[PDB]
Amino acid sequence: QENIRINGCAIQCRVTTEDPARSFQPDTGRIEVFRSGEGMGIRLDNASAFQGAVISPHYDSLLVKVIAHGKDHPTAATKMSRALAEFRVRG
Amino acid sequence: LEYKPIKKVMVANRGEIAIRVFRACTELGIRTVAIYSEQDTGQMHRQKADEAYLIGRGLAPVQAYLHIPDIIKVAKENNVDAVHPGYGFLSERADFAQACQDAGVRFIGPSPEVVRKMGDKVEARAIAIAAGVPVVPGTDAPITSLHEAHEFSNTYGFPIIFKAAYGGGGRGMRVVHSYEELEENYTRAYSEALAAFGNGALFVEKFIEKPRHIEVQILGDQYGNILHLYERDCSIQRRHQKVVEIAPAAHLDPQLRTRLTSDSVKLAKQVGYENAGTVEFLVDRHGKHYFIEVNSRLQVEHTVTEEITDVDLVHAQIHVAEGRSLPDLGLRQENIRINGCAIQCRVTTEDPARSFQPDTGRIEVFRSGEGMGIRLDNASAFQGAVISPHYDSLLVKVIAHGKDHPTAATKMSRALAEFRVRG
Amino acid sequence: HGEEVTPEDVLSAAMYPDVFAHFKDFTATFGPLDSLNTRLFLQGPKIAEEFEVELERGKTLHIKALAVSDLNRAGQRQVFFELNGQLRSIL
Amino acid sequence: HGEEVTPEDVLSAAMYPDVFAHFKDFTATFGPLDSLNTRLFLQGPKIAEEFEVELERGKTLHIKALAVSDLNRAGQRQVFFELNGQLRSIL
Numbered sequence: 128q129e130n131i132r133i134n135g136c137a138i139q140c141r142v143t144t145e146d147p148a149r150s151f152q153p154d155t156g157r158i159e160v161f162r163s164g165e166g167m168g169i170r171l172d173n174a175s176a177f178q179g180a181v182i183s184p185h186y187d188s189l190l191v192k193v194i195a196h197g198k199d200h201p202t203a204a205t206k207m208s209r210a211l212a213e214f215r216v217r218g
Numbered sequence: 219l220e221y222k223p224i225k226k227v228m229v230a231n232r233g234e235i236a237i238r239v240f241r242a243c244t245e246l247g248i249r250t251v252a253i254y255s256e257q258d259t260g261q262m263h264r265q266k267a268d269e270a271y272l273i274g275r276g277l278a279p280v281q282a283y284l285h286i287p288d289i290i291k292v293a294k295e296n297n298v299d300a301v302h303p304g305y306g307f308l309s310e311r312a313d314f315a316q317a318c319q320d321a322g323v324r325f326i327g328p329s330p331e332v333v334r335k336m337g338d339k340v341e342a343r344a345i346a347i348a349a350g351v352p353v354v355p356g357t358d359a360p361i362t363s364l365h366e367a368h369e370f371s372n373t374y375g376f377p378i379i380f381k382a383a384y385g386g387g388g389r390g391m392r393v394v395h396s397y398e399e400l401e402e403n404y405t406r407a408y409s410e411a412l413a414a415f416g417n418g419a420l421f422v423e424k425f426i427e428k429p430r431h432i433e434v435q436i437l438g439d440q441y442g443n444i445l446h447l448y449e450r451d452c453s454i455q456r457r458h459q460k461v462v463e464i465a466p467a468a469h470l471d472p473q474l475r476t477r478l479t480s481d482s483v484k485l486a487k488q489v490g491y492e493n494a495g496t497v498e499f500l501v502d503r504h505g506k507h508y509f510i511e512v513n514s515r516l517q518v519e520h521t522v523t524e525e526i527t528d529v530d531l532v533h534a535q536i537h538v539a540e541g542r543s544l545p546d547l548g549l550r551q552e553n554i555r556i557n558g559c560a561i562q563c564r565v566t567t568e569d570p571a572r573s574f575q576p577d578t579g580r581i582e583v584f585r586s587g588e589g590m591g592i593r594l595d596n597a598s599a600f601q602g603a604v605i606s607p608h609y610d611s612l613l614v615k616v617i618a619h620g621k622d623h624p625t626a627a628t629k630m631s632r633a634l635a636e637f638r639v640r641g
Numbered sequence: 642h643g644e645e646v647t648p649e650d651v652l653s654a655a656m657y658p659d660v661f662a663h664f665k666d667f668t669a670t671f672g673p674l675d676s677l678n679t680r681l682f683l684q685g686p687k688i689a690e691e692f693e694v695e696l697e698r699g700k701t702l703h704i705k706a707l708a709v710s711d712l713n714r715a716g717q718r719q720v721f722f723e724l725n726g727q728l729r730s731i732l
Numbered sequence: 733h734g735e736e737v738t739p740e741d742v743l744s745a746a747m748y749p750d751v752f753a754h755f756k757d758f759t760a761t762f763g764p765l766d767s768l769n770t771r772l773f774l775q776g777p778k779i780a781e782e783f784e785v786e787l788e789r790g791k792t793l794h795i796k797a798l799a800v801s802d803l804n805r806a807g808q809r810q811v812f813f814e815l816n817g818q819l820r821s822i823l
Binding site for chain 3: 779780798799800801802804810812819821
């Protein structure tokens with residue numbers, strides 16, 4: 128318990144393939160354009176994402192698990208706003 | 219006290235640093251401008267910023283980024299408030315800096331006077347002798363007679379090293395142990411210096427077996443306030459160049475690292491530097507440090523300290539370029555601390571077998587292996603990527619942040635295993 | 642049809658409603674036009690012909706047409722394109 | 733051309749050394765044979781058709797043919813293949 132010390136702040140997000148308009152109803156399809164975005168305080172986790180991929184509805188619609196570290200909460204919020212801008216998932 | 223905020227910044231280079239500055243600006247919400255040459259329309263930087271403009275229509279690609287007036291006119295036309303010159307291309311150019319001041323466009327970096335004062339080795343030697351740490355010991359003046367070398371071998375020590383001035387070649391590197399060896403080595407060194415080269419400005423220095431050059435990073439405001447970042451180790455060298463990097467100290471005496479810290483702080487105060495810089499020393503096995511020089515632009519391994527200290531350097535550069543003082547940022551000694559072990563590698567399309575020569579061609583398959591504490595910076599990596607045969611051969615930079623130095627070593631070894639670049 | 646209505650657009654709809662509906666529908670389903678060369682507008686690109694499209698002030702698009710697939714899924718032919726830094730495929 | 737050759741292969745070299753050199757060259761170049769279907773080995777994959785390639789007890793991969801481009805400038809063709817989920821262009 129005593130060696131480990133709290134260090135910094137971090138925020139974790141999951142990117143989904145739900146239609147954020149109708150009912151957050153998950154969408155299905157095939158990827159066309161995939162662009163990934165990394166920074167200093169950025170960290171990405173790829174589930175099934177690549178160029179010309181196919182997702183199957185038998186399993187979850189989890190594509191990217193992202194964690195951003197910073198020296199405070201607002202820094203992490205802004206860092207993730209920028210990171211979400213950086214990706215480019217088209218199709 | 220003076221607040222002159224930034225509305226747009228212009229990058230006058232190409233590649234990974236361009237992406238770095240663009241992401242920093244968009245994280246600060248700074249309007250971004252990108253510039254490309256005719257050959258280099260395939261990178262990601264030109265389409266990653268908001269705007270892309272061509273330069274050097276007929277000039278050579280190696281000098282395509284070296285044309286000041288055109289990029290000056292582009293900066294003016296796009297209402298560029300501040301420009302950052304990056305590294306290697308025009309940061310060493312004092313003409314461009316004074317021109318940047320002439321156009322009124324804010325400059326990201328020190329004042330042109332400091333850059334010009336650095337100049338040749340002679341200003342550095344004069345300033346180091348006047349006010350600074352001892353420089354590598356030896357002879358300030360050239361040796362042109364047997365008697366200077368004989369007296370300096372008699373006085374300091376029989377084993378000495380002959381080096382040749384006004385030349386970067388290693389052919390002027392000779393070893394002296396004894397009188398009979400002294401005169402013969404002096405004679406042959408003088409012969410080679412006057413034959414292969416011109417002025418034989420030979421210098422006598424002490425016998426050095428193992429150099430270990432150690433780097434110090436310095437930030438300051440325009441208000442006379444100076445913070446050293448922390449130290450970095452570069453014991454690894456192919457022959458004279460960086461291949462991998464180790465920021466936390468392998469074998470450093472805290473007294474000696476404290477001496478280096480205070481010396482770098484006082485010398486930054488002496489120079490009166492205004493932006494990002496670094497002082498590199500050269501230590502012996504015994505425990506003596508010697509100045510080598512200072513880089514006035516933002517070093518490549520800067521971001522390595524970015525993992526050491528949990529502070530951004532490009533943001534701090536932006537903020538001092540605005541006019542803020544470091545205490546406004548809360549940039550003081552006590553909060554910045556060593557946090558973790560760091561190792562640095564860079565991938566190049568070169569074959570380490572015969573002559574470390576680069577390879578050119580088209581990559582067939584590439585995959586990513588980003589780790590839990592493994593940070594990746596992609597220079598030019600995509601499906602169907604073609605590497606230019608005239609520009610640099612840098613593709614990916616990998617950062618390993620491990621709880622231990624062997625921790626990062628094994629993690630980044632696994633990362634090397636997972637990466638696949640074929641063809 | 643959304644918020645993108647201006648007084649001149651109102652006038653254009655007022656004089657000619659039906660063709661305006663057709664035009665807005667077509668532009669929406671096909672993206673911006675008039676940024677094409679007339680060659681591309683009527684003839685379209687020829688395979689192994691690279692070309693350039695300008696979209697905004699600094700906005701350059703280098704498009705090279707790689708190949709055209711055949712009929713696979715009840716009349717779904719695939720085509721292959723190369724943009725600066727990426728390869729795309731369209732059905 | 734021996735880097736892991738076996739004494740059994742030494743016997744083979746004693747048998748037909750010239751044909752030995754030819755087979756070794758061909759093997760180091762195009763890789764191992766005798767992992768392929770007879771029809772696939774002789775006439776080859778079909779366009780808009782996918783098959784399976786076993787490598788080891790577990791190394792299992794799949795290949796689909798997409799299309800074939802035309803000779804570009806000097807008798808060079810671009811062929812599009814789909815691996816497990818990734819795409820490869822082959823010259």
